[PDB]
């Protein structure tokens, strides 16, 4: 058994972290005060759930988590909320002035004065770890903390823990939800500074999650908690193989081996089916074939784009519920005949499959109906580069007039970091186009 | 369509199906970058306080 | 008030649809790079499909199908036909065709190609070929010469069977090709425009010297220039369907629909239904339509051959008005509301 | 969190007083500072504008400044006069005679340090001060001249807080003296340099609204100030009520101000109210709030382009309908928003409506059309300055013509900078 520390930065990372840990507790049968009746070896262990929870002599099961916000109001609601008991006060870290949607303010100005405190609170968790594999980092692209502080954190984690893997869960900005006009700047800036410190990153476009809640959950104006419980299901699908017995994606390094052959192109597309409303009176349960097929509709992807006009490098299916291998291969067979699924020449056209027999657990009073089988697909397709094209184009429009630039320079950032970051992104877009398109 | 390295346990199964075969900077470099920005800030503040003194 | 932007100004047909849309009084043109449009009439190359369908509160529609270029480039079409099971190696309406990469670039069929050539040489069959790509065309029965010529130009070229016995219209003993305009809407309805055209040669067809290429190449450009008899029999070297129908009735005792059109509608249907899973926008966050130009040849036994599909066609001058009104009707106002000039191509045989 | 409010001069104090009257009545706090509402949302951000007192009375974090005692005696006598901390009344005795120079250089200098002492004692009492707001006019002497002197001193002592002003622009239609274009031009230069966001309230626009659409035939300063209270309440909604959006000026400034000197916002309000019963639909709120006739700055939005926009809807309504209506002015008038700032319109909503309305909308536009306000002030200025007319009132207090020439150059620059981005 090897432990994993989750790091939640900014509002988006904290409120999503709350969503995840709520779900993890429901899944492992841990209650809000940290007690796990089914855990029969009291005060210690090395089961697979122990990679995420640690144990105290009194029988409390404690997330291997640090929450970090440069302003207190969001983590205060953790400290006062229904899971107050579960986290040690030392794992909730607040500033008092936030980064005002400004990458430079979170990285340089407010970053410098809190980075050492965070690294030592991170180190207090790493010290109760007999074997650490590395980190899960939750953050928004568009926030000033989520973007600027995270990239500073990511740089130093590489130094202080250079043999450990670092995975991110990144909220990509979407005007239907988004908080700010400068979020394209913050996104490009922090992707450029984090690109080499991140081994594999799962992007969630707030636009895709929003529309899934409107169309499939009949929520006409989705809240953050709507958005986050759905994001939480998908994250828990992705992490279940670290918390549960199995042989696929058993540690963080397998995530890069299985999903990232080229290390810069480390943005797997997540697709998830089915999302069913709990208010749906009469619902016909969907089959293995139907939910595997739903993995290839764009309307179910965490990032709207079109995988038909790209190439795959890797592909996992993670099933939860009543699924058996024979039905997967029958579903896969029928799908490859009816759909454009082309791989890059230097990879096998194939699927790594993982099944866990316990179906998704749903938060009581949530918006998701309980289902008998679900699947989350993780496909490293070059079509995700569409999201970089979108982001980069918005960045180009504003920076051509230096709009808002003065806010960043005023924090001590130099204008040239903008153009460096944007040139890195220019490379990244061409890497994607090299791998994933052949000549016109 | 080959179905390979099947693994079972009470929690679930895992395997691999193949349809077709193939055809970092320093700590000191970081806190220097952080201090160079801090001085660019403290300079622009001194330029303001000098202007306000004029 | 719907909104639209124009990003191909060198487009005869969408120039006219732009003006037809303004005249409605319900469409406003924005500037090229304004993102708040309902409709994009976009560029031919590098059209930024990845940026469509992400504007909250805006149904967006573009006049091109992403991926539809695998039908409209000569090398791709060949590769599509022989690799797709619905079209087949065993495809009766496509001329034998082989992709050939030049020597500088070093898949490629060139040695599978002359298998067919020498099987024809010692088979004593007529064996003229034609080399082409996506003006630099050579028609010769010396295989030894055509792989000569492909490699001194630097682009990938396809070599295709030459149709040595084409149907020839009299008076003239002269070649032609047929161009049909088909519209695929956002619902993937396939609409054939009821008017086609015959792009005539006005030179009698000479089967003994293919090095002169003006009785062999029916392109409106080459006839406008090289041929001494441009404008001789038909206005603009363009024959329309009413004439070509009655010529077939008088000269050959059939009609256009029975002799040729059934075969054309079968080829259009088969090509677009093949690539439909790859380009459909049915469940996508933006929508596509596209106007295509299909080009056919008729041999003397009245068999129709597909020679190429063009994804950005110009229209014939007389027809611009009616086709372009038709595009607005069924491609644009179908999505943005304010007897048909199209034949819907649908067939569902049971087996 | 906490904001320190400052109101300077005759106009700054009258509008300031009715602002505090209006928002104190929203938050349930009565004239003696005693709370008496029925919801806890009235109290959740009450600290942004109020200190909690002995007996948990609520006292405005407000300093009242004048160079004469007339108007502030009127405030102490006024409806909510006793709400204010009496130590926060700072006044001289001789007035400023509608003279910028007296406000900024002579009479004002004598009293500015005693104002800064009360500022300091109000910031030290602040858990985490985020910045200041000043209400003043630019056409007189105290609020114009001393007000901008105070803004300069406050920046010196707090260079990293947000400075925010509600600035009444002078108009010949509502005019106290001929020298207003001089006082306004001197003040605008200070504002370009030393504030993060300035709400341009044009007495011209407040008059025309009062006349053309409220059909008040003889508008008083009281009628003008009703409009000013209503839109000040509206723009400060996020600072005072719980919402998705936190109560901080810095995020607003960052998202509204693409270039630092272009921070002069055109405010707007709907429905336009004089001191009725019809339900206003969400499509109507939206159409009006963007209507030129609802702008408090007498500029025509269709003469310029919106760099950024913030909009604040108040009441019980469907934010799906709000979302739809906002998306449909931007998508049906995309001409008038710069294409080089994507998604430059932000919309916020608050459940609690203002007194007397079930639904209101407040508009905050950073339009390049605001140049028209500055060119108007500039033409009036030049018409006197080319004859050095009325200058003696200023050279008498130490000023030189050079300082006028510099101030008019700076405003003409500001107008050119607006025009550069209306063509970009
Ligand atoms: N899915 C989801 N997105 C969020 C959430 N909170 C914010 N976002 C999005 O993240 C971006 C804003 O970033 P934040 O995380 O709030 O910024 P921050 O990290 O708190 O940084 P500062 O507040 O600027 O110090 C916007 O695009 C939001 O739509 C959340 O809880 N769930
Ligand atoms: N295998 C073949 N057999 C007989 N004739 C052929 C032929 N291939 C091409 N042609 C003739 O050459 C002419 C044009 O060839 P090509 O397919 O390259 O069209 P093109 O792209 O150059 C102009 P457009 O796009 O308008 O059709 C045809 O009209 C036809 O007369
Ligand atoms: C919307 O009105 C208000 C908004 C805010 C606020 C809080 C936190 N983040 C943000 C982002 C933006 C924004 C503004 C414009 C654009 C184009 C994009 C984004 N505004 N904003 C504060 C407020 O208090 C004073 C407020 O009232 C005026
Ligand atoms: N809307 C409004 N404008 C005012 C008011 N009082 C003065 N003004 C304007 O303010 C200018 C004179 O400023 P004033 O406040 O009397 O000067 P000060 O007291 O010396 O700062 C002129 O433009 C007046 O029209 C008021 O109460 N409401
Ligand atoms: Ca245990
Ligand atoms: Ca590393
Ligand atoms: Ca004196
Ligand atoms: Cl290490
Ligand atoms: Mg925050
Ligand atoms: Mg062509
Ligand atoms: Mg006065
Ligand atoms: Mg003193």
Coordinates of C-alpha atoms in Angstrom, one line a residue, chain D residues 45-404:
Chain D
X45 CA -22.3 41.8 5.0
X46 CA -23.4 44.7 7.3
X47 CA -19.7 45.0 8.4
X48 CA -18.6 46.2 4.9
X49 CA -20.3 49.6 5.6
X50 CA -20.9 49.4 9.3
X51 CA -19.0 49.1 12.6
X52 CA -20.7 47.2 15.4
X53 CA -21.1 49.5 18.5
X54 CA -21.7 49.4 22.2
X55 CA -25.0 47.4 22.5
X56 CA -24.3 46.1 19.0
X57 CA -25.7 49.3 17.5
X58 CA -24.5 49.7 13.9
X59 CA -22.5 52.8 13.0
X60 CA -21.6 53.7 9.4
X61 CA -17.9 53.7 8.7
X62 CA -18.3 57.2 7.3
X63 CA -16.4 60.5 7.6
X64 CA -18.1 63.8 6.8
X65 CA -15.8 66.6 5.5
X66 CA -16.6 70.2 4.8
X67 CA -14.7 73.5 4.9
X68 CA -17.8 75.2 6.1
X69 CA -20.3 73.9 8.7
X70 CA -23.6 74.7 6.9
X71 CA -24.2 71.4 5.1
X72 CA -22.9 69.2 7.9
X73 CA -25.1 70.9 10.4
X74 CA -28.0 70.2 8.0
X75 CA -26.9 66.5 8.1
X76 CA -26.7 66.3 11.9
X77 CA -30.3 67.7 11.8
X78 CA -31.4 65.6 9.0
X79 CA -33.4 62.3 9.0
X80 CA -30.6 59.9 9.8
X81 CA -28.2 62.6 11.3
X82 CA -27.6 60.9 14.6
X83 CA -26.6 57.6 12.9
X84 CA -23.1 59.1 12.4
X85 CA -20.2 58.8 14.8
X86 CA -19.9 62.5 16.0
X87 CA -16.1 62.3 16.0
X88 CA -16.3 61.8 12.3
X89 CA -17.6 65.3 11.5
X90 CA -14.5 67.2 10.4
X91 CA -15.1 70.8 9.3
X92 CA -13.3 74.1 8.9
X93 CA -15.1 77.4 9.0
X94 CA -14.3 79.7 6.0
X95 CA -15.5 77.6 3.1
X96 CA -13.8 77.2 -0.3
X97 CA -15.9 79.6 -2.4
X98 CA -16.3 77.1 -5.2
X99 CA -12.5 77.4 -5.6
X100 CA -10.5 74.3 -6.4
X101 CA -7.4 76.1 -5.3
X102 CA -8.8 76.8 -1.9
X103 CA -9.9 73.2 -1.6
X104 CA -6.6 71.7 -2.6
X105 CA -3.9 74.1 -1.7
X106 CA -4.8 76.7 1.0
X107 CA -8.0 76.3 3.0
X108 CA -8.0 72.5 2.4
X109 CA -4.4 72.0 3.4
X110 CA -5.1 73.4 6.9
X111 CA -7.8 70.8 7.6
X112 CA -6.6 67.7 5.6
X113 CA -4.4 66.2 8.3
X114 CA -7.3 66.2 10.8
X115 CA -9.4 64.3 8.2
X116 CA -6.6 61.8 7.8
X117 CA -6.5 61.2 11.6
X118 CA -10.2 60.1 11.5
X119 CA -9.6 58.0 8.4
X120 CA -6.7 56.3 10.3
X121 CA -8.8 55.6 13.3
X122 CA -11.5 54.1 11.1
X123 CA -9.0 51.8 9.3
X124 CA -7.3 50.6 12.4
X125 CA -10.7 49.4 13.6
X126 CA -11.0 47.4 10.3
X127 CA -10.5 43.6 10.4
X128 CA -9.2 43.8 6.9
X129 CA -9.8 47.1 5.1
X130 CA -10.1 46.8 1.3
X131 CA -10.5 50.4 0.3
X132 CA -12.3 53.7 0.3
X133 CA -15.2 55.4 -1.4
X134 CA -15.5 59.1 -1.7
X135 CA -18.7 61.0 -2.7
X136 CA -18.1 64.5 -3.9
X137 CA -18.8 66.9 -6.7
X138 CA -16.2 68.2 -9.1
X139 CA -17.7 71.6 -9.7
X140 CA -17.3 73.3 -6.3
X141 CA -14.2 73.8 -4.2
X142 CA -14.3 71.5 -1.1
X143 CA -15.4 68.2 -2.6
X144 CA -13.5 68.9 -5.8
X145 CA -10.3 70.5 -4.5
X146 CA -10.1 69.1 -1.0
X147 CA -11.6 65.8 -2.1
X148 CA -8.8 65.2 -4.6
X149 CA -6.3 66.3 -2.1
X150 CA -7.6 63.7 0.3
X151 CA -7.6 61.1 -2.4
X152 CA -3.9 61.9 -2.9
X153 CA -3.0 61.7 0.8
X154 CA -5.0 58.4 1.2
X155 CA -3.1 56.9 -1.6
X156 CA 0.2 57.9 0.0
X157 CA -0.7 56.2 3.3
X158 CA -2.5 53.2 1.7
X159 CA -1.0 52.7 -1.7
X160 CA -2.3 49.1 -2.0
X161 CA -6.0 49.7 -1.1
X162 CA -8.8 50.3 -3.7
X163 CA -9.8 54.0 -4.2
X164 CA -13.4 54.3 -5.5
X165 CA -15.4 57.5 -6.1
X166 CA -18.9 58.7 -6.9
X167 CA -18.2 61.9 -8.7
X168 CA -21.0 64.4 -9.7
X169 CA -20.0 66.2 -13.0
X170 CA -21.1 69.8 -13.4
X171 CA -23.6 71.0 -16.0
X172 CA -24.6 74.5 -17.2
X173 CA -28.2 73.2 -16.9
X174 CA -27.8 72.8 -13.1
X175 CA -25.1 75.3 -12.4
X176 CA -23.9 77.2 -9.3
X177 CA -21.0 79.3 -10.8
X178 CA -19.1 79.9 -14.0
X179 CA -15.9 78.3 -12.8
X180 CA -17.2 74.7 -12.7
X181 CA -15.4 73.7 -15.9
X182 CA -12.2 74.9 -14.3
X183 CA -12.8 73.0 -11.0
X184 CA -13.9 69.8 -12.9
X185 CA -10.9 69.8 -15.2
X186 CA -8.5 70.2 -12.3
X187 CA -10.3 67.4 -10.6
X188 CA -10.5 65.0 -13.5
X189 CA -6.7 64.9 -13.8
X190 CA -6.4 63.9 -10.1
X191 CA -9.0 61.2 -10.7
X192 CA -7.3 59.7 -13.8
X193 CA -4.1 59.2 -11.7
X194 CA -5.4 58.3 -8.2
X195 CA -8.7 56.3 -8.3
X196 CA -9.3 52.7 -9.4
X197 CA -13.0 53.3 -10.5
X198 CA -15.0 56.5 -10.8
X199 CA -18.7 56.6 -11.2
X200 CA -19.4 59.5 -13.5
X201 CA -22.7 61.1 -12.4
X202 CA -23.6 63.9 -14.8
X203 CA -25.9 66.5 -13.4
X204 CA -26.8 67.1 -17.0
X205 CA -28.2 63.5 -17.3
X206 CA -29.8 63.7 -13.9
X207 CA -31.6 66.9 -15.0
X208 CA -32.8 65.5 -18.3
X209 CA -34.1 62.3 -16.7
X210 CA -35.9 64.4 -14.1
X211 CA -37.4 66.6 -16.8
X212 CA -38.0 64.4 -19.9
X213 CA -39.1 61.2 -18.4
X214 CA -40.1 61.8 -14.7
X215 CA -41.8 64.9 -16.1
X216 CA -40.8 67.0 -13.0
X217 CA -41.0 70.5 -14.5
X218 CA -38.8 72.3 -12.0
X219 CA -36.2 69.7 -10.7
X220 CA -34.6 70.4 -7.3
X221 CA -31.3 69.1 -6.1
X222 CA -33.6 66.9 -4.0
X223 CA -34.9 65.3 -7.2
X224 CA -31.5 64.8 -8.6
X225 CA -30.3 63.2 -5.4
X226 CA -33.2 60.7 -5.4
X227 CA -31.8 59.3 -8.7
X228 CA -28.3 59.3 -7.2
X229 CA -29.4 57.4 -4.1
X230 CA -31.2 54.8 -6.2
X231 CA -28.2 54.0 -8.4
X232 CA -25.6 54.2 -5.6
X233 CA -27.8 51.6 -3.7
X234 CA -27.8 49.5 -6.9
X235 CA -24.0 49.5 -7.7
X236 CA -23.2 48.7 -4.1
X237 CA -25.5 45.7 -3.9
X238 CA -22.7 43.1 -3.9
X239 CA -21.0 45.0 -1.2
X240 CA -24.0 44.7 1.1
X241 CA -26.0 41.5 0.4
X242 CA -25.1 37.8 0.3
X243 CA -24.6 36.4 -3.2
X244 CA -22.5 34.2 -5.5
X245 CA -20.2 37.3 -5.8
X246 CA -18.2 38.5 -2.8
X247 CA -18.1 42.1 -1.6
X248 CA -14.8 43.2 -3.1
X249 CA -13.8 46.1 -5.2
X250 CA -10.5 44.6 -6.5
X251 CA -12.1 41.8 -8.5
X252 CA -14.6 44.4 -9.9
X253 CA -11.7 46.8 -10.8
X254 CA -9.7 44.0 -12.4
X255 CA -12.6 42.9 -14.6
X256 CA -13.9 46.3 -15.5
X257 CA -10.6 48.2 -16.2
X258 CA -8.5 47.0 -19.2
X259 CA -6.3 50.1 -19.2
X260 CA -5.6 51.9 -16.0
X261 CA -6.7 55.4 -16.9
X262 CA -9.9 54.2 -18.6
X263 CA -11.7 53.7 -15.3
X264 CA -14.6 56.2 -15.7
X265 CA -17.9 54.2 -15.6
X266 CA -21.2 55.3 -17.0
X267 CA -23.9 54.2 -14.5
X268 CA -27.6 53.4 -15.3
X269 CA -30.8 52.5 -13.5
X270 CA -34.2 51.0 -14.3
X271 CA -37.1 51.5 -13.7
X272 CA -36.6 55.3 -13.5
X273 CA -38.5 56.3 -10.4
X274 CA -39.6 59.7 -9.0
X275 CA -40.4 60.1 -5.3
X276 CA -45.7 53.2 -9.4
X277 CA -47.4 49.9 -9.3
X278 CA -46.9 48.1 -12.7
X279 CA -44.9 44.9 -12.7
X280 CA -41.7 45.4 -14.7
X281 CA -40.8 42.3 -16.7
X282 CA -37.3 41.0 -17.1
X283 CA -37.3 41.9 -20.8
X284 CA -38.2 45.5 -19.8
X285 CA -35.6 45.9 -17.0
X286 CA -33.0 44.7 -19.6
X287 CA -34.1 47.0 -22.4
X288 CA -34.4 50.1 -20.2
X289 CA -31.1 49.6 -18.1
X290 CA -29.3 49.7 -21.5
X291 CA -31.4 52.6 -22.8
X292 CA -29.5 55.9 -23.3
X293 CA -32.3 57.6 -21.4
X294 CA -31.5 55.6 -18.3
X295 CA -27.8 56.6 -18.3
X296 CA -26.6 58.9 -15.5
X297 CA -23.9 60.3 -17.7
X298 CA -25.1 62.4 -20.6
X299 CA -23.3 60.4 -23.3
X300 CA -24.8 58.3 -26.1
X301 CA -23.7 54.7 -25.8
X302 CA -24.2 54.2 -29.6
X303 CA -21.5 56.8 -30.2
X304 CA -18.9 54.5 -28.6
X305 CA -18.1 50.9 -27.8
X306 CA -18.5 49.0 -24.5
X307 CA -15.1 47.9 -23.2
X308 CA -16.7 46.1 -20.2
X309 CA -20.2 46.0 -18.6
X310 CA -21.5 44.9 -15.2
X311 CA -25.2 44.5 -14.5
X312 CA -27.0 43.9 -11.3
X313 CA -30.6 42.7 -11.1
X314 CA -32.5 43.0 -7.9
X315 CA -35.7 41.1 -6.9
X316 CA -37.5 37.8 -7.3
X317 CA -37.2 36.8 -11.0
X318 CA -35.9 33.9 -13.2
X319 CA -32.2 34.1 -13.7
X320 CA -32.9 31.9 -16.7
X321 CA -34.8 34.8 -18.1
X322 CA -32.1 37.2 -16.9
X323 CA -29.5 35.1 -18.6
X324 CA -31.5 34.9 -21.8
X325 CA -32.2 38.7 -21.9
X326 CA -28.6 39.6 -21.2
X327 CA -27.4 37.2 -23.8
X328 CA -29.8 38.8 -26.3
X329 CA -28.8 42.4 -26.0
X330 CA -25.1 41.3 -26.5
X331 CA -26.0 39.0 -29.4
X332 CA -28.4 41.5 -31.1
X333 CA -26.1 44.5 -30.5
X334 CA -22.7 42.9 -30.8
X335 CA -21.6 45.9 -32.8
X336 CA -21.3 48.0 -29.6
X337 CA -19.1 45.7 -27.5
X338 CA -15.5 45.4 -28.4
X339 CA -14.8 42.1 -30.0
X340 CA -11.2 42.0 -28.5
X341 CA -12.5 41.5 -24.9
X342 CA -14.4 38.2 -25.0
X343 CA -17.4 37.8 -22.7
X344 CA -17.1 41.4 -21.4
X345 CA -20.6 41.5 -19.9
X346 CA -21.0 40.2 -16.4
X347 CA -24.4 39.8 -14.6
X348 CA -25.1 39.5 -11.0
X349 CA -28.4 39.0 -9.1
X350 CA -29.6 39.7 -5.6
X351 CA -32.9 38.4 -4.2
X352 CA -33.6 41.6 -2.1
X353 CA -35.2 44.5 -4.0
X354 CA -34.9 48.2 -3.2
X355 CA -37.6 49.9 -1.2
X356 CA -40.7 50.5 -3.3
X357 CA -39.9 48.2 -6.2
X358 CA -40.2 44.5 -6.7
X359 CA -37.7 44.5 -9.5
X360 CA -34.8 46.8 -10.4
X361 CA -31.7 46.7 -12.6
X362 CA -28.5 48.7 -12.2
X363 CA -26.1 49.2 -15.2
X364 CA -22.4 49.9 -14.9
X365 CA -20.8 50.6 -18.3
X366 CA -17.1 51.3 -19.1
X367 CA -18.0 52.8 -22.5
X368 CA -15.6 54.8 -24.7
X369 CA -18.6 57.1 -25.3
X370 CA -17.8 58.7 -21.9
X371 CA -15.3 60.8 -23.8
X372 CA -18.3 63.0 -24.8
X373 CA -18.6 64.0 -21.1
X374 CA -14.9 65.0 -21.0
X375 CA -15.0 66.8 -24.4
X376 CA -18.0 68.8 -23.1
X377 CA -16.1 69.8 -19.9
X378 CA -13.1 70.5 -22.1
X379 CA -14.9 72.9 -24.5
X380 CA -16.5 74.9 -21.6
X381 CA -13.0 75.1 -19.9
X382 CA -11.3 76.3 -23.1
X383 CA -14.0 78.9 -23.8
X384 CA -13.0 80.8 -20.7
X385 CA -9.3 79.8 -20.5
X386 CA -8.5 81.2 -24.0
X387 CA -9.3 84.6 -22.4
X388 CA -7.8 83.7 -19.0
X389 CA -11.3 84.6 -17.7
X390 CA -11.9 84.1 -14.0
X391 CA -8.4 82.9 -13.4
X392 CA -7.6 85.6 -10.8
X393 CA -9.7 83.6 -8.2
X394 CA -7.0 80.9 -8.6
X395 CA -3.8 82.8 -9.1
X396 CA -4.8 84.6 -6.0
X397 CA -4.3 81.4 -4.1
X398 CA -0.9 80.5 -5.5
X399 CA -1.7 78.8 -8.7
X400 CA -0.1 79.4 -12.1
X401 CA -1.6 79.3 -15.6
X402 CA 0.8 76.5 -16.3
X403 CA -1.1 74.1 -14.0
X404 CA -4.3 74.9 -16.0

